[PDB]
From a paper:
Dihydroxy acid dehydratase (DHAD) is the third enzyme in the plant branched-chain amino acid biosynthetic pathway and the target for commercial herbicide development.
To determine if small-to-large amino acid mutations at these hydrophobic residues can decrease active site volume and increase resistance to AA, we generated multiple mutations at V496, V497, and I177 in AthDHAD followed by kinetic and structural characterizations. The substitutions of V496L and V497I may push the loop where G490 is located toward the center of the channel. The overall structures of the AthDHAD mutants I177F, V178W, V496W, and V497F displayed high similarity with the wild-type AthDHAD, with the RMSD of 0.123 Å (888 core Cα atoms), 0.275 Å (994 core Cα atoms), 0.142 Å (1,034 core Cα atoms), and 0.283 Å (994 core Cα atoms), respectively. The obvious difference was in loop 490–497, which forms the side wall at the narrowest point of the substrate channel.
Residue numbers in the entry:
A (entry chain A), B (entry chain A): 4 to 12, 16 to 574
């Protein structure tokens, strides 16, 4: 029983805004509303909060004001009042590699707080959110779940791949350019050319990374309109979707079809099914748990393992494959993918969606995957018989951990631990003495929600390992997160994190660590009694901040196995 | 020693953005920056985060996107790169009277978190903030203090008074209209006419309420440019100020004149001096404490009492007087007011400001208060010999409380307590049985930062008291806040709040409460031993929420005497 936001004061379409538009005792409210341009007749209409995440310093978000204007126009075209407002967001592509990354994950929870705040204070009847980026998307859904007022999330759209001189690039090309330069693979001028053509325009990062994972998952959950996740950012049809969201939201107000009517155990499973089938990001574990909690439901790591075991990986999409979200768009979009998964019996078609109809009804007449397409494998010949996402426990991750397992890595890794108290000291060690890493289980700890602080996503450690030729010769463990595609036994989200005294914070250099994918365990040769000896002598490190938004995060955040929720 | 945000990697103007624009290892960052439109030459420039609080559902904020575009143009005209982003805010005029008010105060702290987040993640060198409303203003300064990067706050400007048929209105006219209708003073049609003409356009609420108090105080603190606080929202000179902020910020980057160089004990006192001289809001106590903490300084309730005792109330401004901020603008603006206070020896002129010069240097050549003006009283004939703001302690507010004391109320009030566990039950009681309030000390408790939750500002209780003719016949105590002008012994901010087991939560109906302004005490006839007896049997009420942004507020917020900071 979630208690968060104001209740409305049955067939009324302005259930909330009537609190301030109708009583004479709210004459001050009505005076403001006339001052912002509402007529007496406008005061009778539903009021839609239109929350975008526009900002100019990221390609994923710089276009969203234009989208928000189209959403407002369509809300007015549907007989409603549209009130635009706008939250913050941050760019992982900009902050990756820097301590700015400590601020990224928590911006999800701040976006949720932001939209909840405005919708509650202004008494809006419904919400249309326009995220464009990584964390923006689940933050908007969490606010929707807390408020439980009719809402639709309009994905801003993925960016198109960059093209120059018969070469094709994305943000990962730009990430990888430094290492290829240092290795001698490319010249400084080729490096510079990659940076000028990797990000050609607006839109979220282009492969099946976190943004496309979550947009697809949220469409599969029924909380975006069909095709929202797969229409590209700069596409004319994205603007048309914006101009239609008001029509759809009107119908949701008439039926009073709310987020907790749409986000259910079965539609959460539908979202998880799309993550497994498409090879989506391990970050979806954090965000789908957070979304489930926001509507008062439960979702555990073991629920992810069960769906992973039930759903084959079918999609030849970056990072693990070759294609990108624009290629999905060209062969029928996300609805064509979900139609195939539904036909295979992998999804529950009875779930209500923001179209006002069920998932099966949305998908009944959509064009199917284009004949001859090579992106989505048939069930008979999947890329992997089960999903990439694997939950591991064992001695060193007793409360869980998350890995992306392709099947190319083998079933076991065993090696002496090489332990670093953060990303910076690992990178200096691999720079000075790369051969000391050969055969080791590398542990980068102190990078969890409280220890980091902020659970930063880390990319430099793994590109340093790949560039040293050590990809098949070591394993990587962290209480933080690893960015992009895996190329080995790379395990993140290890719980309890080191800052909390979890076993990962008790590992010492030379401890033999064995990762067993089949048993789903990360174990240590150190005896349980010696581990307990170390725990008795362990003292928590001082927090790295004492003020500001990150210290509030330290005070509030739950574990990664609990989705790093902050409001419980 | 504040530890919150990233440090820069001496004469460089791009101290922070060089972290991502210069190293080859940040090629991903640079690819994004080219995609958003930066040239190779642009990468060399400082990057300014331009944070507005635009949203369409409030007159105070609906214009701020236009202002933000002018700020960006001036940043580019100054040889810098401008990156706009935008936070949330909420409208007290809309939410007043409703549980939406529970979300208002905390939006200050969420704005602070929001701007801190973006500036840290994106590595911006400086900040220009464009608030328009109540809580927006101190939230932007708190972010500035945490980051300690050069910053300027551009006030959006006050709204102009409304005019219709030789009558003049503001938001308070609209608030008061319901009660005048119920009393028979005005007809329904006159009531409706007030609502259509009370708020004529963009801008913050027009008298010396919280917005104008804090804009004036922040200008007096040196963190806005001269006249920022007094130029009206729709004025051409406000746009010109926006287009100049970049020139001024460039110079701050050259001198590296930072917020903790500008916000000092002496400039905090300067801000407090302006609050006392102008009759500013008791809310300035919360916000100036929060601003002081954000730069690692201390500011106590007793510091406010000392300044109040030292500074006469001089300004004939609403709520207590007749004039409004536009009238100040017409007689020389905030700089003319501060020039007079400086000439009187009430302020410290050596404080550095965002002009790159001292306060005395800014004021040396500004036009003085217009000859003949009747708004600012001479020191010889003040409206009150000391400031309105009074700190009270005593048995029932051992950790402090705040009142606005005009001098019209007498020095003492004594009466039996009439106790309500929230605003709703008080209002029902005064509706049913108004005479039962005559002679009482009314206690509205459970309205503090944790109890409310959110320390709501309350207006309906006091207009109900005025409308029942009880203004001179009772006193009002709360652990929350009272809105607008006082018309009696109306004390808010009582600490500890009732939810925390403070004495206010132990008062029983009939307890004789005596308010003594001269002794600065709110005392009870109940013996200390009986109070302690009650405390031993007291149990905290359940919190009113268990999820969402308000439950996080309950988890994080300090007392009103500590400025309701949330990050400590
Ligand atoms: S930084 Fe926005 S999705 Fe990658
Ligand atoms: S609601 Fe914005 S200052 Fe009054
Ligand atoms: Mg990312
Ligand atoms: Mg207010």
């Amino acid at each position: 029983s979630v208690t968060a936001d104001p209740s409305p004061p049955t067939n009324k379409l302005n259930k909330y805004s009537s609190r301030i538009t109708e009583p004479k005792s709210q004459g001050g409210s009505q005076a403001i509303l006339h001052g912002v341009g509402l007529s007496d007749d406008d005061l009778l209409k539903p009021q839609i909060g239109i929350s975008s995440v526009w900002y100019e310093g990221n390609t994923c978000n710089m276009h969203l004001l234009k989208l928000s204007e189209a959403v407002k126009e369509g809300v007015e075209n549907a007989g409603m009042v549209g009130f635009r407002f706008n939250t913050i967001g941050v760019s992982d592509a900009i902050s990756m590699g820097t301590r700015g990354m400590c601020f990224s994950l928590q911006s999800r929870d701040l976006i949720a707080d932001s939209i909840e705040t405005v919708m509650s204070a202004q008494w809006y009847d419904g919400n249309i959110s326009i995220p464009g980026c990584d964390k923006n998307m689940p933050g908007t859904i969490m606010a929707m779940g807390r408020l439980n007022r009719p809402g639709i999330m309009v994905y801003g759209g993925t960016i198109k791949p960059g093209h120059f001189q018969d070469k094709t690039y994305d943000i990962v090309s730009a990430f990888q350019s430094y290492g290829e330069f240092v290795s001698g693979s490319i010249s400084d001028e080729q490096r510079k050319t990659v940076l000028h053509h990797s990000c050609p325009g607006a839109g979220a990062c282009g492969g099946m990374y976190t943004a496309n994972t979550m947009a697809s998952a949220i469409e599969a959950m029924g909380m975006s309109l069909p095709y929202s996740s797969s229409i590209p950012a700069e596409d004319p049809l994205k603007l048309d979707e914006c101009r239609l969201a008001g029509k759809y939201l009107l119908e949701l107000l008439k039926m009073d079809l709310k987020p907790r009517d749409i986000i259910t155990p079965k539609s959460l499973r539908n979202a998880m099914v799309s993550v497994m089938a498409l090879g989506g990001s391990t970050n979806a574990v954090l965000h789908l748990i957070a979304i489930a909690r926001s509507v008062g439901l439960e979702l555990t790591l073991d629920d992810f393992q069960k769906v992973s075991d039930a759903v084959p990986f079918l999609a030849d999409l970056k990072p693990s494959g070759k294609y990108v979200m624009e290629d999905i768009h060209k062969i029928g979009g996300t609805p064509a993918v979900l139609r195939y998964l539904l036909e295979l019996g992998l999804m529950d078609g009875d779930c209500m969606t923001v179209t006002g109809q069920t998932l099966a009804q949305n998908l009944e007449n959509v064009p199917s995957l284009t004949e001859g397409q090579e992106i989505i494998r048939p069930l008979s010949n999947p890329i992997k018989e089960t999903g990439h996402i694997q939950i591991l426990r064992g001695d060193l991750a007793p409360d869980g951990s998350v890995a992306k397992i392709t099947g190319k890595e083998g079933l076991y890794f065993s090696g002496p631990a090489l332990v670093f108290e953060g990303e910076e000291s690992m990178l200096a060690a691999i720079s000075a003495d790369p051969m000391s890493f050969k055969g080791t289980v590398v542990v980068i700890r102190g990078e969890g929600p409280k220890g980091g602080p902020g659970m930063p996503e880390m990319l430099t450690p793994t590109s340093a390992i790949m560039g040293a030729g050590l990809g098949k010769e070591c394993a990587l463990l962290t209480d933080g997160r690893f960015s992009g595609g895996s190329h080995g036994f790379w395990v993140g989200h290890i719980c309890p994190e080191a800052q909390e005294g979890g076993p990962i914070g008790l590992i010492k250099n030379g401890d033999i660590i064995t990762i067993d994918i089949g048993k789903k365990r990360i174990d240590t040769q150190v005896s349980p009694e010696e581990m307990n000896d170390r725990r008795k002598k362990w003292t928590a490190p001082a927090y790295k901040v004492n003020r500001g938004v990150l210290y509030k995060y330290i005070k509030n955040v739950q574990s990664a196995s609990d989705g790093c929720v902050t409001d419980e």
